[PDB]
Amino acid sequence: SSENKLRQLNLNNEWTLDKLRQRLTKNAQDKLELHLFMLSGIPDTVFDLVELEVLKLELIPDVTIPPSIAQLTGLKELWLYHTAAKIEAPALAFLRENLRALHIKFTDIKEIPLWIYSLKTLEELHLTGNLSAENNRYIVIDGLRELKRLKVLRLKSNLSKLPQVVTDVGVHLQKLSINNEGTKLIVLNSLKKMVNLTELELIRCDLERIPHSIFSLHNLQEIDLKDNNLKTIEEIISFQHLHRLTCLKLWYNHIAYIPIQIGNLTNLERLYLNRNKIEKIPTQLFYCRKLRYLDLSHNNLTFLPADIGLLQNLQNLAVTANRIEALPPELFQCRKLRALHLGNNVLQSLPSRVGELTNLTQIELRGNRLECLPVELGECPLLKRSGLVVEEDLFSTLPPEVKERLWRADKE
């Protein structure tokens, strides 16, 4: 049509290849992406960007995805933010055979392309918006069954319950992520069907108690229950049967204590308990002897038990913003430590045994009640001034020789 042609010509003239290349971004996931927003359509010059991996369209009306999309032979992801998208069969056949991730943020069904359920090779789907209509609960995802290659489903949709169609896709799904924006999710036994899941995120779902369905997910490797108003977590006793569980995130809750049965989660390598209300660490936690990452920051801890020295694989330890008076000497038996986040405590001294931390590259000390610093920080071969985060006057207490080598290490 003549009207469409003139509008398209004008858009192409406004979006030269040089301008598009200046707009490209190497994004956080190291992917080459183009983001377009608030335009009248898609400039045809987009499809000369043959290196593109991610296309993001935001708030673009009346969009038609054209057959030249097949020129983007490395396109893997398409993001549609408030952008309805029409397509003909050649462009769709290309997406059906090559697109790996689809993100859609939508206001209502009008912004959901009916062709998305035919995207037979899709591995990830991310939906942000309400999934239901009158007499049509969860219709937006009824078609998930046809996405037989799907590995990752992310929903940000204020769900009262987990839709049955989700639990049905559990044979092949590997990662389920729900961000419920504080809407209480009721799980009630249906989650047990997602036997292939290795990663589960139930974020901001007002769970209050860890749901018992999780115990049936015997392939789980990682669980994240951020911001669910958890006060007690006795239910972790049943995690002892999840033999592949290596990452437990219960951060950002109201947890008042750590049950001793945490020590039977013996395959834990990363444990995040930061931003809770915990006052002490049970000694049984140190039976989690494969721990590499431990974050207990922003709790109410006064001391670290001597048994922390039994965590021989500990590499990153954070206890920021507690009220710890001193560090046990046994902490420095943890020879693999690389990072020690100790800020905003009430430390009065930093033990001389820090010199034994051969692999230390990062130590945050600010906001403590230190009068001086110990010379033995100079014994840490890999530490640089940029990794020693402390007030300048405290840094000055080190020997000039030590201070010289820390400064050099950065500039070398």
From Swiss-Prot:
GO molecular function annotation: cyclic-GMP-AMP transmembrane transporter activity; identical protein binding; volume-sensitive anion channel activity
UniProt topological domain (Cytoplasmic) ranges: 2-412
Residue numbers covered by motif Di-leucine motif: 310-311
Protein's cellular compartments: Cell membrane; Lysosome membrane
Disruption phenotype: Increased prenatal and postnatal mortality, growth retardation, and multiple tissue abnormalities. B-cell development is slightly impaired, without affecting B-cell function. Mice however show a cell-autonomous early block in thymocyte development and impairs peripheral T-cell expansion and function. Conditional deletion in germ cells leads to abnormal sperm and male infertility: the cytoplasm of late spermatids appears swollen, preventing reduction of the cytoplasm during further development into spermatozoa.
Tissue: Ubiquitously expressed. High levels detected in the bone marrow; lower levels found in peripheral blood cells. Highly expressed in pancreatic beta cells.
Coiled coil (residue ranges): none
Keyword Plastid assigned: no
Predominant cellular place of this UniProt entry's protein: membrane
LRR repeats: 15-26, 27-49, 51-72, 73-96, 97-119, 122-146, 147-169, 171-193, 194-217, 218-241, 243-265, 266-288, 290-311, 312-334, 336-357, 358-380, 382-405
UniProt superkingdom: Eukaryota
Keyword DNA-binding annotated: no
Record entry for activity regulation: Inhibited by (4-[(2-butyl-6,7-dichloro-2-cyclopentyl-2,3-dihydro-1-oxo-1H-inden-5-yl)oxy]butanoic acid), which plugs the channel like a cork in a bottle by binding in the extracellular selectivity filter and sterically occluding ion conduction. Lipids may block conduction in closed heterohexameric channels.
Entry keywords, A to Z: Acetylation, Cell membrane, Differentiation, Disulfide bond, Glycoprotein, Ion channel, Ion transport, Leucine-rich repeat, Lysosome, Membrane, Phosphoprotein, Repeat, Spermatogenesis, Transmembrane, Transmembrane helix, Transport
Modifications the protein undergoes after translation, according to the UniProt entry: N-glycosylated.
Annotated disorder: Defects in Lrrc8a are the cause of ebouriffe (ebo), a spontaneous mutation that causes male sterility. Spermatozoa present in the epididymis display severe malformations, mostly of the tail. A drastic decrease of the spermatid population is observed, whereas spermatogonia and spermatocytes seem moderately affected. Defects are caused by decreased volume-regulated anion channel (VRAC) activity in germ cells. Oogenesis is not affected but embryos derived from ebo/ebo females show early developmental failure.
Swiss-Prot/TrEMBL domain comment: The volume-regulated anion channel (VRAC) channel forms a trimer of dimers, with symmetry mismatch between the pore-forming domain and the cytosolic LRR repeats, a topology similar to gap junction proteins.
Family classification: Belongs to the LRRC8 family.
Quaternary assembly: Heterohexamer; oligomerizes with other LRRC8 proteins (LRRC8B, LRRC8C, LRRC8D and/or LRRC8E) to form a heterohexamer. Can form homohexamers in vitro, but these have lower conductance than heterohexamers. In vivo, the subunit composition may depend primarily on expression levels, and heterooligomeric channels containing various proportions of the different LRRC8 proteins may coexist. Interact with GRB2. Interacts with NOX4; this interaction prevents the ubiquitin-mediated degradation of LRRC8A.
Name of the protein in question: Volume-regulated anion channel subunit LRRC8A
Record organism: Mus musculus
Lineage of origin: Eukaryota, Metazoa, Chordata, Craniata, Vertebrata
Residues of the full protein shown: 398 to 808 of 810
